[PDB]
Amino acid sequence: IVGGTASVRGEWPWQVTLHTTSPTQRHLCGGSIIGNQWILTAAHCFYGVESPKILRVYSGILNQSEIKEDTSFFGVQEIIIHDQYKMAESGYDIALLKLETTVGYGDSQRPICLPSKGDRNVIYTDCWVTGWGYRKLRDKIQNTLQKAKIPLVTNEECQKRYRGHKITHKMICAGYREGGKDACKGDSGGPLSCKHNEVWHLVGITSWGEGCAQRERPGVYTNVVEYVDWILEKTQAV
Numbered sequence: 001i002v003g004g005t006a007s008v009r010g011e012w013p014w015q016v017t018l019h020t021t022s023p024t025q026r027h028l029c030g031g032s033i034i035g036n037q038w039i040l041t042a043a044h045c046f047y048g049v050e051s052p053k054i055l056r057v058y059s060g061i062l063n064q065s066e067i068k069e070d071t072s073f074f075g076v077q078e079i080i081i082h083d084q085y086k087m088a089e090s091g092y093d094i095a096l097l098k099l100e101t102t103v104g105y106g107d108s109q110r111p112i113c114l115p116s117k118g119d120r121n122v123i124y125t126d127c128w129v130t131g132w133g134y135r136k137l138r139d140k141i142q143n144t145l146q147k148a149k150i151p152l153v154t155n156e157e158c159q160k161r162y163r164g165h166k167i168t169h170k171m172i173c174a175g176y177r178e179g180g181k182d183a184c185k186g187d188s189g190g191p192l193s194c195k196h197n198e199v200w201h202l203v204g205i206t207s208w209g210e211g212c213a214q215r216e217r218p219g220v221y222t223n224v225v226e227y228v229d230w231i232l233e234k235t236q237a238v
């Protein structure tokens, strides 16, 4: 996160750190708990990934330093990538991780609500992008979970900022015209959370952008509302 502040423990209980084991253990991506055996993340996160055996999901973490060899985690049973996915810039940048065990809900880990069909028309005024990603173009993964309040941008406005790209209604953008506050390297897969009528909704998944926090280059996110049916198709299969 560029231009953010340390989060308080338990502020974003849906937020997870998705670690890889190959070649060495390190944070790979963010993700959001959406069900007791489900993590919603970005599909691009799995570019390297040949098997889910190398993944580890950590829930209820504020600081990366809390993760050691004895720290409990959730294994990944299955990686479900949207079948129309080619690349982050083209869309369909959505993936589900089916966990090997059930997440026990508590004050340190619980699910975030998906947006509603009727809520495609609602105006979100209180949106936050969270993660352990970089604070500048070239740094390292942060220890403490960072947060930043970002305004949502229209598709027409986002499309003007991304000449040569096609910004679909399946993407949502967030950013300040002047920049200064944005998601950065290591924040992808994580949530774009918006509070509406005292309840938090998963509005977007951190996907791509031209650099970090640059003037007139908003962060591009998977528009979760456009994928509710696909999430239910995958999570509610008979």
Ligand SMILES: NC[C@H]1CC[C@H](C(=O)N[C@@H](Cc2ccccc2)c2cc(-c3ccc4c(N)[nH]nc4c3)ccn2)CC1
Pocket (backbone or CB within 6 Å): 026, 027, 028, 029, 044, 045, 046, 047, 133, 140, 141, 182, 183, 184, 185, 186, 187, 188, 206, 207, 208, 209, 210, 211, 212, 213, 218, 219, 220
């Ligand atoms: N302003 C908009 C914003 C949107 C989000 C975007 C983003 O986060 N993209 C991801 C895409 C990706 C590529 C490969 C695997 C997963 C995700 C990314 C992550 C990292 C990365 C990850 C872990 C690291 C580690 N452990 N040390 N260094 C690490 C660096 C480097 C480069 N790109 C940046 C721009």
